[PDB]
PDB file of C-alpha atoms in Angstrom:
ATOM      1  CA  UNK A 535     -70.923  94.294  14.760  1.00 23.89           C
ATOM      2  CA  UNK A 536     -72.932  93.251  17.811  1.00 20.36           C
ATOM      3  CA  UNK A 537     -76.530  94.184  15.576  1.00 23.52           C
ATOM      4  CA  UNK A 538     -75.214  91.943  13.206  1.00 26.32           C
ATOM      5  CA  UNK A 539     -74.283  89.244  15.579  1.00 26.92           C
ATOM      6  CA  UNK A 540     -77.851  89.587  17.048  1.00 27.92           C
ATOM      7  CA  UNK A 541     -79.682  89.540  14.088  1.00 25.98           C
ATOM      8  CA  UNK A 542     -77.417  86.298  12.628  1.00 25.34           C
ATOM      9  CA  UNK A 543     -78.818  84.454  16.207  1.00 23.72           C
ATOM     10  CA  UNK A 544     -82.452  85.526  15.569  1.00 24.69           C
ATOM     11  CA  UNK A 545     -82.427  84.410  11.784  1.00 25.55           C
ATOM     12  CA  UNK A 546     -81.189  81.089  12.851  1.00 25.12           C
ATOM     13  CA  UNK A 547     -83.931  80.560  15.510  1.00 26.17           C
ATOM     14  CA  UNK A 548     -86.176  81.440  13.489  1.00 26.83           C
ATOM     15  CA  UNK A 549     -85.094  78.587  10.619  1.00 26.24           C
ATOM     16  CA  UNK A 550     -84.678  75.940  13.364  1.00 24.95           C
ATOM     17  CA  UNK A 551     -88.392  76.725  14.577  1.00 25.89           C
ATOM     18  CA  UNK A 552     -90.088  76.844  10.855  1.00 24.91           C
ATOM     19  CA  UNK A 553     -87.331  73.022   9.884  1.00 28.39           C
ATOM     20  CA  UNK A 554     -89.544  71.698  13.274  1.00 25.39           C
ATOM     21  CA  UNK A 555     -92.864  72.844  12.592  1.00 25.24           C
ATOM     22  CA  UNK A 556     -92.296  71.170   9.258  1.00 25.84           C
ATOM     23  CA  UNK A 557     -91.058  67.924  10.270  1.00 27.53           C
ATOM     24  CA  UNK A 558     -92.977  67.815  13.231  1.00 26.56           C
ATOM     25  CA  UNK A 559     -96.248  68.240  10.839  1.00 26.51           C
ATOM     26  CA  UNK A 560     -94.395  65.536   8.312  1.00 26.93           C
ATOM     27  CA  UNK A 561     -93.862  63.336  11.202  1.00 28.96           C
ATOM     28  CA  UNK A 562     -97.359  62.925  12.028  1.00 27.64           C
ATOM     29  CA  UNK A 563     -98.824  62.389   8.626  1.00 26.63           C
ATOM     30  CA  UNK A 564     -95.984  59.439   8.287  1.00 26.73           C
ATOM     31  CA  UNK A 565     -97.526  58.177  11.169  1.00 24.84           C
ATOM     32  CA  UNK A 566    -100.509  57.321   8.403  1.00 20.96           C
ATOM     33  CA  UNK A 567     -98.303  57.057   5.642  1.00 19.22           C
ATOM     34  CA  UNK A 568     -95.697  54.762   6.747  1.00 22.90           C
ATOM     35  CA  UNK A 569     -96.874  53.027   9.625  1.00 20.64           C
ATOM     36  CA  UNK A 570    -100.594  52.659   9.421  1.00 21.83           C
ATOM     37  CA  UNK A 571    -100.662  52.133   5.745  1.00 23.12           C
ATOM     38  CA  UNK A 572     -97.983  49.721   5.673  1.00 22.08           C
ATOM     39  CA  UNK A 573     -97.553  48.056   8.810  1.00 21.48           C
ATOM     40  CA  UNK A 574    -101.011  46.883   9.221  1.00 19.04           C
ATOM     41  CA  UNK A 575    -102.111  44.392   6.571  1.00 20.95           C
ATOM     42  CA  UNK A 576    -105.220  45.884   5.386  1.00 19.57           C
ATOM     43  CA  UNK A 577    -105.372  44.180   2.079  1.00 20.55           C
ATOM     44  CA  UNK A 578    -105.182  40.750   4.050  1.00 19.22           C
ATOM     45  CA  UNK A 579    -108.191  41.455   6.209  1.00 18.02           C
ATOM     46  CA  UNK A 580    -110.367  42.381   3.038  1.00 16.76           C
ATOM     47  CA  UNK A 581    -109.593  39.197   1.397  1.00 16.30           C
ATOM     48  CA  UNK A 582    -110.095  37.723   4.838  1.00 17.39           C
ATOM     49  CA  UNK A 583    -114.034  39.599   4.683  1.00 16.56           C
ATOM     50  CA  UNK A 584    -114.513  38.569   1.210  1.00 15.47           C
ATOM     51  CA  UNK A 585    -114.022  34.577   2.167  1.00 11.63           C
ATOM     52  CA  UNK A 586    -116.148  34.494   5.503  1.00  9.95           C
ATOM     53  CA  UNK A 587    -118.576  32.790   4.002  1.00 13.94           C
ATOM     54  CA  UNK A 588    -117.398  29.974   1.976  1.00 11.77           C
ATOM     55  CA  UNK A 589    -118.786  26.942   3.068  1.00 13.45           C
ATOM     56  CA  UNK A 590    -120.959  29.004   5.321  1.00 14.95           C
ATOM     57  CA  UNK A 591    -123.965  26.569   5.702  1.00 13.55           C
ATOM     58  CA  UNK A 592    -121.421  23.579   6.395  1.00 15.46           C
ATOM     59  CA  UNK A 593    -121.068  25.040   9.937  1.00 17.22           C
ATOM     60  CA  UNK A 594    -123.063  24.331  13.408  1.00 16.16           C
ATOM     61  CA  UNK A 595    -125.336  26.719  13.638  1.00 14.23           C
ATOM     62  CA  UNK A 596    -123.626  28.577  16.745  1.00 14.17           C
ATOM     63  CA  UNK A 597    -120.265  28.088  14.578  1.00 14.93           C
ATOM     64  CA  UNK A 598    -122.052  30.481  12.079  1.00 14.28           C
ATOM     65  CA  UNK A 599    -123.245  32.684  14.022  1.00 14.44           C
ATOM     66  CA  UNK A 600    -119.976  33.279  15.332  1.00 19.39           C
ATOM     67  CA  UNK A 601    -118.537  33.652  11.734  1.00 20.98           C
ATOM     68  CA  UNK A 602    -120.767  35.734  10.849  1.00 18.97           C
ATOM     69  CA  UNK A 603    -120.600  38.421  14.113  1.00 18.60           C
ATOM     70  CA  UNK A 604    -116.652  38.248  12.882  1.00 16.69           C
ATOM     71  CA  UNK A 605    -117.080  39.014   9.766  1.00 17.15           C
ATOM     72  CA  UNK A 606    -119.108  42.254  10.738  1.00 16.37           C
ATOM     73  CA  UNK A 607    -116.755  43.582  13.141  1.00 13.95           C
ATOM     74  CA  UNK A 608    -113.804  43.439  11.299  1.00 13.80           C
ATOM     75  CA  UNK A 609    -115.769  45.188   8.053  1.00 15.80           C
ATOM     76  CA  UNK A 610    -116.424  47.735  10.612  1.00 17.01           C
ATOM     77  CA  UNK A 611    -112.276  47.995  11.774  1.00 20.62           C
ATOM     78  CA  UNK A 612    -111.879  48.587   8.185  1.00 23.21           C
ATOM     79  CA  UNK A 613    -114.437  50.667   7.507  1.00 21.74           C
ATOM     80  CA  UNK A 614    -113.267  53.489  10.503  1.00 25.15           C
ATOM     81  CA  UNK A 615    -109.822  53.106   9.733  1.00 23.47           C
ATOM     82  CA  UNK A 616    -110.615  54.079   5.809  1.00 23.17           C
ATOM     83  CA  UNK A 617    -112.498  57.037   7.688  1.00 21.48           C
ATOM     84  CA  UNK A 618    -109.994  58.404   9.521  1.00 21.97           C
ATOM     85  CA  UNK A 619    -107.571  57.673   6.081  1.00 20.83           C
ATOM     86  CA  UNK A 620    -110.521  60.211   4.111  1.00 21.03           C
ATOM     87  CA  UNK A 621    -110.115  62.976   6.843  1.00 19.92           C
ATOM     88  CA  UNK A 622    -106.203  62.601   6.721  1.00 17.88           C
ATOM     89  CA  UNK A 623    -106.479  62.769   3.121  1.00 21.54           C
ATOM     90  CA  UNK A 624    -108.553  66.337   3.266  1.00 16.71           C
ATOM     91  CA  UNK A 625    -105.877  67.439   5.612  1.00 17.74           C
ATOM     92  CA  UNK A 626    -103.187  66.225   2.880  1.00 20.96           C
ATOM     93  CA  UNK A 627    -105.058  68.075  -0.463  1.00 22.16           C
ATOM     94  CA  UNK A 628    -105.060  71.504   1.581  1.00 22.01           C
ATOM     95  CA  UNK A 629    -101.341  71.371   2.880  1.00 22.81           C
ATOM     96  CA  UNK A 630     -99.941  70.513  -0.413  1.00 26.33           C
ATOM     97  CA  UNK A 631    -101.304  73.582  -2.191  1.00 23.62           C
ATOM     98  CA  UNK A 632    -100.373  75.678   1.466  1.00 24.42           C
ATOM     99  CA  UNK A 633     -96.558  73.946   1.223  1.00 29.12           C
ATOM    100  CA  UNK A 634     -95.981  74.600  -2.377  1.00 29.79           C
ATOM    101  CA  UNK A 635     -97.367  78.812  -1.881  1.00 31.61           C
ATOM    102  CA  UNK A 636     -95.124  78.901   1.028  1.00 29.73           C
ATOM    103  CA  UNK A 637     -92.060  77.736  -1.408  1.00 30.99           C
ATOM    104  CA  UNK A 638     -92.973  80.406  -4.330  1.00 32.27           C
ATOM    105  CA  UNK A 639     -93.423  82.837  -1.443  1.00 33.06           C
ATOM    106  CA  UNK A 640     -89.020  83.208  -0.765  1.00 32.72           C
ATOM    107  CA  UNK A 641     -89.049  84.716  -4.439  1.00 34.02           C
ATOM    108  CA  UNK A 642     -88.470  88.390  -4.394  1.00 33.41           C
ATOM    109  CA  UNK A 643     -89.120  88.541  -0.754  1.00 36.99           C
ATOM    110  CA  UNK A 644     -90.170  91.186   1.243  1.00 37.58           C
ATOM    111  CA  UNK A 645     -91.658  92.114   4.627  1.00 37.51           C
ATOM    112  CA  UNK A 646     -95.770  90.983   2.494  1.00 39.22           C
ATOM    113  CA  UNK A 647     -93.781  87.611   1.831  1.00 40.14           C
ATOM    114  CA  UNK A 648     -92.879  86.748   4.797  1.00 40.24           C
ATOM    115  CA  UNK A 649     -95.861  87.396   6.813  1.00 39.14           C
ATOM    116  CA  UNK A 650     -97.436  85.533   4.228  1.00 39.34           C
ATOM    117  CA  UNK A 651     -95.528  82.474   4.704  1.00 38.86           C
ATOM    118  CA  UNK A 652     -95.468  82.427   8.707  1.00 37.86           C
ATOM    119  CA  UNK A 653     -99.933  82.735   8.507  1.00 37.30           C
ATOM    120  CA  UNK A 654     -99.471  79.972   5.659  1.00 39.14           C
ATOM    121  CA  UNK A 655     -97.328  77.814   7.642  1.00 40.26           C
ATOM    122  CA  UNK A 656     -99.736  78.075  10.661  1.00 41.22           C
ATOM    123  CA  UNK A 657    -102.654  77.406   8.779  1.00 40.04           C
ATOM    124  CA  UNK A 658    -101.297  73.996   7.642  1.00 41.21           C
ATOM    125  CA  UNK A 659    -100.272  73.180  11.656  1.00 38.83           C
ATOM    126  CA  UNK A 660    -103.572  74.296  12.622  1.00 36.62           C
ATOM    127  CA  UNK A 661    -105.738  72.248  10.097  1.00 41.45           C
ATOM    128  CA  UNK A 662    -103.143  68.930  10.973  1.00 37.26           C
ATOM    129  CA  UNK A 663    -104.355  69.653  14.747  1.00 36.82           C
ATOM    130  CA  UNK A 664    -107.943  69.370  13.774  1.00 38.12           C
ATOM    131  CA  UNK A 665    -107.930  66.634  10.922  1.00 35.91           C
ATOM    132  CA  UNK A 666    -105.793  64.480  12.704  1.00 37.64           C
ATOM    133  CA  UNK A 667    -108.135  65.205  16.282  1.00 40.45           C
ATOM    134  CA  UNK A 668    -111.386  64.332  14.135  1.00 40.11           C
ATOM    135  CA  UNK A 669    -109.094  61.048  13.018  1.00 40.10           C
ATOM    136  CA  UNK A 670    -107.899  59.641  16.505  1.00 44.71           C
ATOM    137  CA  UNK A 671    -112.275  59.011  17.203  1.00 46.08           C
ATOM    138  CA  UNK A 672    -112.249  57.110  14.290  1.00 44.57           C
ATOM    139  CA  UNK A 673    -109.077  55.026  15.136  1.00 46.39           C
ATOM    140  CA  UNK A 674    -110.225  54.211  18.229  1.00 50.59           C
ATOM    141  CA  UNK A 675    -113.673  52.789  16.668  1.00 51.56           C
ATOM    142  CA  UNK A 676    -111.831  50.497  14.140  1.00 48.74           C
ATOM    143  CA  UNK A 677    -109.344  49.631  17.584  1.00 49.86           C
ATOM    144  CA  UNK A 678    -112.265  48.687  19.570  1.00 47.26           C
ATOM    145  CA  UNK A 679    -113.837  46.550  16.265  1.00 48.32           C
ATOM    146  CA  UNK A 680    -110.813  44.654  16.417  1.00 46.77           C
ATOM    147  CA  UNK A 681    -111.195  44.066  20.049  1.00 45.26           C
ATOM    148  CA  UNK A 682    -114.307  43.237  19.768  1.00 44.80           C
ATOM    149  CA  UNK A 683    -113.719  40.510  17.009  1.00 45.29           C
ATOM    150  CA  UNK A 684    -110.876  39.283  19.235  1.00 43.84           C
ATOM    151  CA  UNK A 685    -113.137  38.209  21.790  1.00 41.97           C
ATOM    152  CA  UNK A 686    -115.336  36.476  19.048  1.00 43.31           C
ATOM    153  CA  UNK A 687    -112.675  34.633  17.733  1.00 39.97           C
ATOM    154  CA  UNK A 688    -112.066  33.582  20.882  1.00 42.64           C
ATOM    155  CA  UNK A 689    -115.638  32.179  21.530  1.00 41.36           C
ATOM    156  CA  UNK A 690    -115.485  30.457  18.326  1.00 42.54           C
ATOM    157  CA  UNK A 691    -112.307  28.802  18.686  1.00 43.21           C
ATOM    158  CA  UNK A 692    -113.919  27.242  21.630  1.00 45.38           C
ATOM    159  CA  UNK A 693    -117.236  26.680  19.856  1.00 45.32           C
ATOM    160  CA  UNK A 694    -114.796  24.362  16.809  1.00 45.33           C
ATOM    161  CA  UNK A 695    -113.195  22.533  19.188  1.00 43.09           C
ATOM    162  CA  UNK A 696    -116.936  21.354  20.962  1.00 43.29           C
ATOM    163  CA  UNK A 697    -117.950  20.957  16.860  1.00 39.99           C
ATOM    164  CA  UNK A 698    -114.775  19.024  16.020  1.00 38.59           C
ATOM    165  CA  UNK A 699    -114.745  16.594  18.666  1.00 39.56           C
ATOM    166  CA  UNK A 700    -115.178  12.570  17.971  1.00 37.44           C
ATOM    167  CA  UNK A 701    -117.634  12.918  20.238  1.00 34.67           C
ATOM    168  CA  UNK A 702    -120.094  15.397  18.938  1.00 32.11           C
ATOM    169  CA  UNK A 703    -123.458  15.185  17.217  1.00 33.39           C
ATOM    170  CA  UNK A 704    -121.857  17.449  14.580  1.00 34.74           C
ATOM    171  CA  UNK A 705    -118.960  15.454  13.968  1.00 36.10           C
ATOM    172  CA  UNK A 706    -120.738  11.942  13.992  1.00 33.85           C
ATOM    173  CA  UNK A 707    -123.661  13.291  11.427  1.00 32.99           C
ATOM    174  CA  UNK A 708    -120.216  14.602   8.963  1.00 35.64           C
ATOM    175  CA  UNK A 709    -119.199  10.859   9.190  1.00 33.72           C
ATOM    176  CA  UNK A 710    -122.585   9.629   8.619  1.00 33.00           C
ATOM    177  CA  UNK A 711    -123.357  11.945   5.849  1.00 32.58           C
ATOM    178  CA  UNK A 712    -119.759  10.643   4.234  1.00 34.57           C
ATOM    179  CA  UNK A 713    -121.420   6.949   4.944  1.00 33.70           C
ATOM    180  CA  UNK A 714    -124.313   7.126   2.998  1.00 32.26           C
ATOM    181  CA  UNK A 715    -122.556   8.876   0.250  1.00 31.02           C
ATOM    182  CA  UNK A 716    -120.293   6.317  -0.311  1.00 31.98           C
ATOM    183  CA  UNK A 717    -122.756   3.940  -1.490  1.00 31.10           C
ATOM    184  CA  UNK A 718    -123.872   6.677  -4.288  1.00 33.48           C
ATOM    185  CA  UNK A 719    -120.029   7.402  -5.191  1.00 33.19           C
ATOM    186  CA  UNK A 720    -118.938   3.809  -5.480  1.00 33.54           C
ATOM    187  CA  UNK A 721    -119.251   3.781  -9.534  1.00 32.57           C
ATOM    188  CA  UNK A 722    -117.517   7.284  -9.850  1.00 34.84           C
ATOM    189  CA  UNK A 723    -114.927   5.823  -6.968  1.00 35.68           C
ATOM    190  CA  UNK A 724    -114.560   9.417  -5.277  1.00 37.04           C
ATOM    191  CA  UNK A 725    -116.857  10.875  -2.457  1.00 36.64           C
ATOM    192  CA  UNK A 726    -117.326  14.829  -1.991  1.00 32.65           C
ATOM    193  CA  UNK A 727    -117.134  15.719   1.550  1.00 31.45           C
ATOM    194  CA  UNK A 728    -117.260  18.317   3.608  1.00 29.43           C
ATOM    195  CA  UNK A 729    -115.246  21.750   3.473  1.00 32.84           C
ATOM    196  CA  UNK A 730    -114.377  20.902   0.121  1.00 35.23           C
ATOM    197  CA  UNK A 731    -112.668  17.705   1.120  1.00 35.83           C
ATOM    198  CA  UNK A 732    -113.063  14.648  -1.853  1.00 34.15           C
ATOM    199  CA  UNK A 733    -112.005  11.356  -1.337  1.00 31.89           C
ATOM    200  CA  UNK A 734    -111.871   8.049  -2.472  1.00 33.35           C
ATOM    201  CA  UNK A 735    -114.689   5.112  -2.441  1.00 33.94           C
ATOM    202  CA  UNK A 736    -112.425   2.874  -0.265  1.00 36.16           C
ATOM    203  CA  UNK A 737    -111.569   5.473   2.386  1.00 37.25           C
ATOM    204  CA  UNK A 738    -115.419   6.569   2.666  1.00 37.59           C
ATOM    205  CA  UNK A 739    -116.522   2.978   2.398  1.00 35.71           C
ATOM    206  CA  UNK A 740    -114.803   2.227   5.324  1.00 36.12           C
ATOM    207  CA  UNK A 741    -112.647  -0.762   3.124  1.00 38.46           C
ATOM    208  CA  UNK A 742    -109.718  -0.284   5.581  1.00 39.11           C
ATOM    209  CA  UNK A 743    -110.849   0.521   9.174  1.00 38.87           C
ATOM    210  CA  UNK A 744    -109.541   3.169  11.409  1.00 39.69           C
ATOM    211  CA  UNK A 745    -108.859   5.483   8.141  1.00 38.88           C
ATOM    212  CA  UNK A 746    -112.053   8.089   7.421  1.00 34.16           C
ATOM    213  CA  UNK A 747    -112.242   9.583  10.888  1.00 33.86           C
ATOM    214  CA  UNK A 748    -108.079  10.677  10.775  1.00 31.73           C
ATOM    215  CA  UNK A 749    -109.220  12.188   7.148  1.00 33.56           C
ATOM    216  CA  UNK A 750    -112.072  13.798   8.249  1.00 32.17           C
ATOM    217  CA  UNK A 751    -110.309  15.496  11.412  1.00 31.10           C
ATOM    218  CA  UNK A 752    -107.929  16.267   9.372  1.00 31.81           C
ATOM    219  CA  UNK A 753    -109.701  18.299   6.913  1.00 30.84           C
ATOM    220  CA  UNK A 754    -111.631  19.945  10.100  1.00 29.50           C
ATOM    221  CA  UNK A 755    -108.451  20.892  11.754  1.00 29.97           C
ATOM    222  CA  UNK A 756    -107.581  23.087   8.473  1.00 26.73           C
ATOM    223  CA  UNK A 757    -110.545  24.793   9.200  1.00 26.34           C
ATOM    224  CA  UNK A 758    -109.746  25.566  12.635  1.00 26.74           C
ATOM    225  CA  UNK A 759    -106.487  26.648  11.795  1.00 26.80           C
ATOM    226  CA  UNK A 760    -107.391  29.186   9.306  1.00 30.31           C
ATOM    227  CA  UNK A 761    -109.362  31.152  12.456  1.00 29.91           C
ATOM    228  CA  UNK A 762    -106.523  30.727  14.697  1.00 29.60           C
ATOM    229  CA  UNK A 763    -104.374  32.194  11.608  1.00 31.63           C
ATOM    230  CA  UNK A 764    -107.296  34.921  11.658  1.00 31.38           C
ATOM    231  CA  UNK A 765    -107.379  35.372  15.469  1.00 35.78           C
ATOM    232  CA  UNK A 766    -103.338  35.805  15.601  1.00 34.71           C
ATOM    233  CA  UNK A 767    -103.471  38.822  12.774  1.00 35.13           C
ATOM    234  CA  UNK A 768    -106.555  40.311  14.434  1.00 36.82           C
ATOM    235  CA  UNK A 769    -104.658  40.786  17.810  1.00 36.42           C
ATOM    236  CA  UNK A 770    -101.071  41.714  16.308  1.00 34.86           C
ATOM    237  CA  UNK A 771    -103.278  44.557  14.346  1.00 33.79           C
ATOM    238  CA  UNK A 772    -105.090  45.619  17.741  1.00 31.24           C
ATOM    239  CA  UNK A 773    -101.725  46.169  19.549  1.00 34.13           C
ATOM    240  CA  UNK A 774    -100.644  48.071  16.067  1.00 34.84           C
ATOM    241  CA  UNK A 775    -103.580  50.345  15.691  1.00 34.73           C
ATOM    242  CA  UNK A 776    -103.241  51.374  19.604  1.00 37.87           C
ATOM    243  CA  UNK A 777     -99.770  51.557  18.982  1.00 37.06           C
ATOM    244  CA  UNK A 778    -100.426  54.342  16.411  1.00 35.51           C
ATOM    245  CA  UNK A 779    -103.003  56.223  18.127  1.00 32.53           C
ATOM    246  CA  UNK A 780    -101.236  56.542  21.292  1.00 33.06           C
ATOM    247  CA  UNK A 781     -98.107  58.002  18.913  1.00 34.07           C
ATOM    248  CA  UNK A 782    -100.347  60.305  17.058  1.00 32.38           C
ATOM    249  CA  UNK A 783    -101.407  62.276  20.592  1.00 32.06           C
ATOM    250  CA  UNK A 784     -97.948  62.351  21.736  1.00 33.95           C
ATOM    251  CA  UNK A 785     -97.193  64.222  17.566  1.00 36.44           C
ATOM    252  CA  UNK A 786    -100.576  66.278  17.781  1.00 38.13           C
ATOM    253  CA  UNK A 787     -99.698  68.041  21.441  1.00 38.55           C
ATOM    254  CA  UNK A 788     -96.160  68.325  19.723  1.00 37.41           C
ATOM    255  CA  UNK A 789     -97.464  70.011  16.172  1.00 38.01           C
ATOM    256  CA  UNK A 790     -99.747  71.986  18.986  1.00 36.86           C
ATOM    257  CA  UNK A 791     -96.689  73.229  21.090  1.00 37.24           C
ATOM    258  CA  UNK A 792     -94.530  74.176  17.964  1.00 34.40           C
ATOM    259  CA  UNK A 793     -97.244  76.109  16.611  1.00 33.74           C
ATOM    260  CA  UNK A 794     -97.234  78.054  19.827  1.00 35.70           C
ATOM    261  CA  UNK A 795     -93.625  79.141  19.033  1.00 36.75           C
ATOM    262  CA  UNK A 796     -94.355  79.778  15.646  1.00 39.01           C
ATOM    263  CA  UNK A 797     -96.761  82.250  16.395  1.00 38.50           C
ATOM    264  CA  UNK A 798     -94.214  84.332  18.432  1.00 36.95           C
ATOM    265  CA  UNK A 799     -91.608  84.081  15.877  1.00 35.78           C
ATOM    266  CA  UNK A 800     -90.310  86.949  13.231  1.00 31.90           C
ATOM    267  CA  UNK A 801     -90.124  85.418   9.934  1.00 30.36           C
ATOM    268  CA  UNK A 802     -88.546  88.346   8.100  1.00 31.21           C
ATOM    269  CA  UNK A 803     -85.084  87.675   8.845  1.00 33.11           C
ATOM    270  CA  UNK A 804     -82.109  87.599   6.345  1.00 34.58           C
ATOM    271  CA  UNK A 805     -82.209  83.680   5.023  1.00 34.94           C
ATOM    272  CA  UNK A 806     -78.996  83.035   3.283  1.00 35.39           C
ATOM    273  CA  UNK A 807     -78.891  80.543   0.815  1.00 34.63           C
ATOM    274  CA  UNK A 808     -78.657  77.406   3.113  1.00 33.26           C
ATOM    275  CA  UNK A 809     -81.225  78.193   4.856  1.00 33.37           C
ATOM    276  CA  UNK A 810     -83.030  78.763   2.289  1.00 34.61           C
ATOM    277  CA  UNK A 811     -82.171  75.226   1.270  1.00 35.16           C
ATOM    278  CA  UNK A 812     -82.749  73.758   4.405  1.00 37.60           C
ATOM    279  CA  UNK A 813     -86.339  75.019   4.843  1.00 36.69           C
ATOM    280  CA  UNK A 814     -87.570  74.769   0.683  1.00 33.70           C
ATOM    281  CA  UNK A 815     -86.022  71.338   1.273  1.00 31.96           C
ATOM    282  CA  UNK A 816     -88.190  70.664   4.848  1.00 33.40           C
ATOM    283  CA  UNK A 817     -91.399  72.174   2.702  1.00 33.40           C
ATOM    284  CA  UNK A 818     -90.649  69.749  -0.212  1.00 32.79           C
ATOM    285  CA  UNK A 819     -90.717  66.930   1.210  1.00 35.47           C
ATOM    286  CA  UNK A 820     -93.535  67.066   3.114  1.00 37.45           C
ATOM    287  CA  UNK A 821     -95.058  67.844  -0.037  1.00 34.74           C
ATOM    288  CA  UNK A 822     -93.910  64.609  -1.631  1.00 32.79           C
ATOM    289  CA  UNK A 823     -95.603  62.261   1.597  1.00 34.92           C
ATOM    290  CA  UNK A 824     -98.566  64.226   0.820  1.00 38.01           C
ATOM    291  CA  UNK A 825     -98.397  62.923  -2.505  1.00 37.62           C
ATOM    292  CA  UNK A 826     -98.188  59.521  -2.019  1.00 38.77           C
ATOM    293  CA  UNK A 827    -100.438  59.437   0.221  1.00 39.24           C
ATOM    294  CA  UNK A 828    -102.943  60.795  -1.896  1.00 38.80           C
ATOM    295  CA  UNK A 829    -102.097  58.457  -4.798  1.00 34.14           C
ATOM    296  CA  UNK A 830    -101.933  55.224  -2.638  1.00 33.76           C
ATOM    297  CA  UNK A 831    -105.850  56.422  -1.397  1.00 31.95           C
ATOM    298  CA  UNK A 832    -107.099  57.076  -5.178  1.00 32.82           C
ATOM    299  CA  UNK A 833    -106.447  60.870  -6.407  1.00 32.47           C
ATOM    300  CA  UNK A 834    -105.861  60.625  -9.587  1.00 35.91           C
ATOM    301  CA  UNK A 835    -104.082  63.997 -10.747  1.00 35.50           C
ATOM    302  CA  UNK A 836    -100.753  64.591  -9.667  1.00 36.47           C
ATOM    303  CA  UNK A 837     -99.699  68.099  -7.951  1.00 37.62           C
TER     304      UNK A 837
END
C-alpha cells in the first residue's frame, strides 16, 4: 500500500543519514589516524631533537645559536601536535563507549531504543565538533613552530656556508687546530679532528700537499648536509600539517551540517536486517579506528 511505500522511503532516509553521520565522524578522526599519524614522520623529528647537540661546542658561536633556536622550535611542533593528539584521544575514549551502547541499543527495540540511539549518536557528533575545534588551535601552533624553524634553518644554512668557507677565521683555526695536533699524533699515526673526523699523521702533517683542506671540507660539507636534510623534512611537514588542518575544517562544518539533519530525523523506523547490517557495520568500525588510535597513543586496556 501507499503507507507502506511511504514508510519504506522514510526508513531508508533515515539509514542513509545515521551511515553519513557515522562515516562523516570516522572520516575526520582518520584525518588523525591515518594521515597525521602516519604521513608525517614524527618519530624522525624526535631523533632529529635528541641529536641537536652533538658536537654542539664544535660550532661558531652564531652557528650554535642557530642550532639551538632549531632545536626549540621544532620540540615545540611536536609538543602541540601531541596536544591536539591528547584532546583527539578524549574525544576517541568517549565515542567508543557511545558507539558500542548505540550497537546493544537495536536489541529488542522499541520506541525508548531508538530515541536512545539518535541522542547517543548526536552526542558523539557533538563532542567530535568540540574536541576536534579545541585541536585545530593546537595544529596551527605546532604549523607555525615549523614555520618558524624553517626560517631558522634557513639563516643557518647561510650562517655554514660563511663558517665553511676557505676563507674564514673559523675554517683556518679548524686547519690550524688539525696542525698542531699532528705533531702530538705522529707516534699514534692518527689525528682526531673535528665533527668526529680522524685521520692519518701524513694527511694532517701536511706530507702530501693540497690533501687536508679537501678532507676537512669534506667532513664540513656532511655537516651541512645533514641541516639541508633537516630543512627539506621540516618544510615537506609544514605543507603536511596545513594540509591537514585545512581538511579537518572542511570535515568539522561537514560532521556540523549532518548533525543538523540528524536532529530532524525519526529514528524509529522498521530497519530490516540489511540495514541493520549496514549501520552496526558503519558503528563498528568507527569503533575499531578509535581503537587504534588509542593503542598507537598509549592506552593500555583494550575495549
Amino acid at each position: 500500500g501507499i503507507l507502506d511505500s511511504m514508510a519504506e522511503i522514510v526508513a531508508d532516509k533515515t539509514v542513509e543519514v545515521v551511515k553519513n553521520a557515522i562515516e562523516t565522524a570516522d572520516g575526520a578522526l582518520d584525518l588523525y589516524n591515518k594521515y597525521l599519524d602516519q604521513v608525517i614522520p614524527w618519530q624522525t623529528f624526535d631523533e632529529t631533537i635528541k641529536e641537536l647537540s652533538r658536537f654542539k661546542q664544535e660550532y661558531s658561536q652564531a652557528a650554535s645559536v642557530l642550532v639551538g633556536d632549531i632545536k626549540t622550535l621544532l620540540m615545540d611542533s611536536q609538543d602541540k601536535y601531541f596536544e591536539a593528539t591528547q584532546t583527539v584521544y578524549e574525544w576517541c575514549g568517549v565515542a567508543t563507549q557511545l558507539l558500542a551502547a548505540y550497537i546493544l541499543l537495536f536489541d529488542e527495540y522499541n520506541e525508548k531504543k531508538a530515541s536512545a540511539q539518535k541522542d547517543i549518536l548526536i552526542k558523539v557528533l557533538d563532542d567530535g565538533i568540540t574536541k576536534l575545534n579545541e585541536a585545530q588551535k593546537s595544529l596551527l601552533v605546532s604549523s607555525q613552530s615549523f614555520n618558524n624553524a624553517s626560517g631558522k634553518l634557513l639563516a643557518l644554512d647561510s650562517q655554514l656556508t660563511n663558517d665553511f668557507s676557505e676563507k674564514s677565521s673559523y675554517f683556518q683555526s679548524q686547519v690550524d687546530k688539525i696542525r698542531k695536533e699532528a705533531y702530538a699524533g705522529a707516534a699514534a699515526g692518527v689525528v682526531v679532528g673535528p665533527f668526529g673526523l680522524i685521520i692519518s699523521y701524513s694527511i694532517a702533517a701536511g706530507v702530501v700537499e693540497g690533501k687536508l683542506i679537501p678532507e676537512l671540507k669534506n667532513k664540513l660539507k656532511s655537516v651541512q648536509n645533514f641541516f639541508t636534510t633537516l630543512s627539506n623534512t621540516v618544510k615537506q611537514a609544514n605543507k603536511d600539517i596545513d594540509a591537514a588542518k585545512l581538511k579537518l575544517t572542511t570535515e568539522i562544518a561537514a560532521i556540523g551540517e549532518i548533525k543538523t539533519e540528524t536532529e530532524t530525523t525519526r529514528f524509529y523506523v522498521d530497519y530490516d536486517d540489511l540495514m541493520l547490517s549496514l549501520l552496526k557495520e558503519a558503528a563498528k568500525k568507527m569503533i575499531n579506528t578509535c581503537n587504534e588510535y588509542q593503542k598507537r597513543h598509549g592506552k593500555k586496556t583494550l575495549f
